[PDB]
Design a protein around this ligand. Sequence first.
Ligand SMILES: Nc1ncnc2c1ncn2[C@@H]1O[C@H](COP(=O)(O)OP(=O)(O)O)[C@@H](O)[C@H]1O
Ligand SMILES: [Zn+2]
Ligand SMILES: [Zn+2]
Lengths: 301, 116
Amino acid sequence: SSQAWQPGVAMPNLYKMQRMLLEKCDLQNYGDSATLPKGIMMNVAKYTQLCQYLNTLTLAVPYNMRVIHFGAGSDKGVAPGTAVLRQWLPTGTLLVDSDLNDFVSDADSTLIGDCATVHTANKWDLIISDMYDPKTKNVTKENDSKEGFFTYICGFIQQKLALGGSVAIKITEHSWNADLYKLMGHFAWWTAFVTNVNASSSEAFLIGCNYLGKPREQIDGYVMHANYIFWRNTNPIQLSSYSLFDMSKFPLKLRGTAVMSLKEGQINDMILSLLSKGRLIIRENNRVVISSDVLVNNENL
Amino acid sequence: AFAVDAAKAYKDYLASGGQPITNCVKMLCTHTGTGQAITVTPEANMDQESFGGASCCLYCRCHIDHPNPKGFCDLKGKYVQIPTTCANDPVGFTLKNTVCTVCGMWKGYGCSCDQL
Ligand SMILES: Nc1ncnc2c1ncn2[C@@H]1O[C@H](COP(=O)(O)OP(=O)(O)O)[C@@H](O)[C@H]1O
Ligand SMILES: [Zn+2]
Ligand SMILES: [Zn+2]
């Protein structure tokens, strides 16, 4: 109904509580296409709606914020999503992006290579991923949990996401991972968010809001992905670009969320409550240092 | 002594009737901004479009060194405002035009410093 004036639709909580079996995803509006504003790329529209939705959550937004964006390149050789993130995030936010393939970016630093090669000394306040392999769209094969870059992302979250931070990780019917859904239960809240511009696709962003570093909920990710597909299969979403035309409240508010260094032993229930409310980030505030592992070979004979 | 002259090549290509560089990244914005040329966030007014800066830079897009001792880029990491009448060719526009160092507007497309 009024969903068409939202930036998109989040998975309703009752769907998260089901125990569905995995089915094929068949979308009623498959092949519909939103009419984008003149000259606007799909990926600008999509990231704009994602950010509009993230504005409604309790993201921690510290000074000296650090954001890392995986899968930021395009077959066009530019980075539309990075450009939207930089628009959204407070001026001065440190933004790093990465992709397998070369591209030109507005990020403060860019690493080209497989995401598994990326290492960072520091922790992050927000992780965005649009990584995707269109080969997974094989409807003739069983739809099993995928490894690859999802294995990397799960480990990266657990090792390098600051307590209190958040993630938005792109999935689809076939591009998903059970452990990533399980990890959503380590946040104060989570959802699967579908942009209104791309609602004819099984794509969603799995959003984990305020990381706690421990299980708050035990989630079976195989069942949860089936629950997600059941929701999509039974709830057609009207394609809509309406939210793109009101950008007056787009910028993410610079909250100046507190950042503290704390050892595990000091994370009591009061700290956990602050983390859960978007009122605290736990990490160091040292320099941001990144690298990409490079395999060396000499093929001369 | 030899240096590739990418700017001359693009200008000559355009005058020969070549298609401008595509896939410059146009941003959604209110179009109620200041209209200044190069800004930290989109600032298009009613008669401009705002673009991601790197995607509108000839040197960034062509994968070539910037014409500057330190190789710094004026556009990367910022947003560039392009008159709507010229938004078919943002790279050509940024290459051919100059920002007023006083008011931050494009000379000839917003700068009123030479008035009175
Ligand atoms: N293991 C990986 N490491 C880094 N980037 C990846 C990896 N797998 C996929 N990507 C990137 O994710 C991006 C997804 O963009 P999308 O347009 O959805 O698909 P594609 O560009 O592959 O057709 C691509 O730019 C792709 O290079
Ligand atoms: Zn440049
Ligand atoms: Zn002037």
